[PDB]
Design a binder for this molecule. Structure first.
Ligand code: HEM
Ligand SMILES: CC1=C[C@@]23[C@H](C=C(C(=O)O)[C@@H]2COC(=O)[C@]32CO2)[C@@H]1C
Length: 397
């Protein structure tokens, strides 16, 4: 008897840690240690999906003495309206109600055209440069930050100011750095809201200023813009880096994609499903039980912490036959859980798919000989950041 302790070791730079797979074959739910409180870890797809849709399972902590968390996690939960369990129902409903209409078909179609031109321009630059080139810096980071600038209605150069603020806000290793970084986001957002009040445009804060005939406080609006800035680019960057690495590992599928860019949507769903980095700590959705729940034969009691392993679930043979294999031809793939599910289902997920699709429509058709310029083993997943990610992807082509 040995209590498994998160995070588990991963000898590979991607995938699911061996011990996590071992637990998943044993059963759907396991008691594990973590950096703080012990938690139920749910590993199989069926149970993860069902509990993500169970409203007794909430982001907010209902416990009388909530355990102290990193500043990073505290900011993340606060941005998701999860910091006060008594107000979370009304606050979270308002948050989704105000943000979902910002991702309208009209905005997404215009965004798609611009995204497509931007990738073409990014790849022409990449192709004109001399190897070795950091693909992370000149492609992965640049497209999603471009998109956030357009969402917020600010010049592209602004991403040179804010492009590391998600990383800094979500650094679990340094509470002081986390708070200084978030203070910069807050300052920047408030200045931006004040300007959109007198110089609006076709962007999301202008629409929020106009919403509820302006009943929303500037702080309400800046809060929603902080969620857009801080969630709107970093994960997409990481998925671009991860998707490149997966397609380099699977040359048969990659060549198919280069030949037929109509396979890009399929590739993108496989990228999202299999794209798990390092120890995959960001592929765990955290929740607390607000009521008793029976899972398998395990009783989750009110107040317990629950780790919902969407990465492990996405690899689950029960849902995806040979779940570890990259396959563009998965007939009618069970919807992966990489955007979550249920009440907090990712709000930017159509935008992210549009971005990823534009990228992988073009990348290996524009640079078919693109390959890693360093061994895979030299790529370092940043475990201390809630959002993880690699810091550089050296490539030749
Ligand atoms: C490939 C890129 C992305 C991935 C893998 C991803 C993943 C996720 C996941 C798993 C959740 C659920 C978290 C939970 O249930 O606790 C979530 C929530 C969220 N995401 Fe995405 N996301 C991505 C891109 C984006 C983009 C581009 C935006 C906005 C521009 C965005 C905005 C949000 C917001 C606001 C939430 C909170 C939803 C809520 O709590 O109600 N994300 N994301
Ligand atoms: C607001 C979010 C938190 C994430 C979710 C995806 C993430 C990621 O891919 O890094 C984050 C990591 O931390 C979490 O708790 C998540 C998984 O729930 C999403 C962007």
């Amino acid at each position: 008897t040995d209590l498994p302790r998160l995070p588990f070791d991963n000898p590979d730079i991607m995938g699911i840690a061996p011990q996590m797979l071992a637990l998943q074959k044993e059963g759907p739910i396991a008691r594990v240690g973590t950096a703080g409180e012990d938690a139920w870890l749910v590993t199989r797809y069926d149970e993860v999906r069902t509990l993500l849709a169970d409203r007794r399972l909430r982001l907010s902590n209902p416990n009388p003495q909530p355990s102290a968390k990193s500043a990073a996690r505290a900011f993340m939960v606060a941005l998701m309206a999860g910091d006060d369990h008594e107000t979370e129902p009304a606050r979270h409903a308002q948050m989704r109600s105000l943000l979902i209409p910002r991702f309208s078909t009209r905005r997404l179609r215009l965004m798609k055209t611009r995204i497509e031109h931007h990738v073409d321009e990014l790849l022409d630059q990449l192709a004109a440069s001399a190897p070795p080139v950091d693909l992370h810096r000149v492609l992965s980071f640049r497209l999603p930050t471009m998109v956030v600038c357009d969402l917020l209605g600010v010049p592209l150069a602004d991403r040179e100011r804010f492009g590391q603020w998600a990383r800094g806000t979500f650094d679990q290793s340094d509470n002081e750095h986390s708070a200084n970084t978030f203070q910069q986001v807050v300052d920047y957002m408030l200045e931006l809201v004040a300007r959109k009040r007198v110089e609006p445009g076709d962007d999301i804060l202008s629409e929020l200023i106009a919403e509820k005939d302006g009943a929303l406080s500037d702080a309400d609006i800046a809060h929603l813009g902080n969620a857009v800035l801080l969630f709107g680019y970093e994960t997409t960057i990481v998925r671009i880096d991860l998707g490149t690495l997966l397609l380099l590992r699977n040359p048969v599928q990659r060549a198919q994609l280069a030949e037929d860019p109509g396979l890009a949507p399929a590739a993108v769903e496989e990228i999202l499903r299999l794209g798990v980095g390092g120890k995959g700590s960001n592929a765990l959705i955290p929740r607390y039980a607000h009521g008793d729940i029976t899972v398998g034969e395990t009783v989750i009691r009110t107040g317990d912490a629950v780790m919902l392993a969407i990465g492990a679930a996405n690899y689950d043979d029960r849902a995806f036959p040979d779940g570890g294999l990259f396959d563009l031809t998965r007939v009618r793939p069970r919807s992966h859980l990489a955007f979550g599910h249920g009440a907090r289902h990712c709000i930017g997920r159509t935008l992210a798919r549009i971005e990823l699709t534009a990228v992988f429509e073009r990348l290996f058709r524009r640079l078919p000989d693109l390959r890693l310029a360093v061994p895979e083993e030299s790529l370092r997943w940043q475990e201390h950041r809630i959002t993880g990610g690699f810091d550089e992807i050296p490539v030749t082509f």
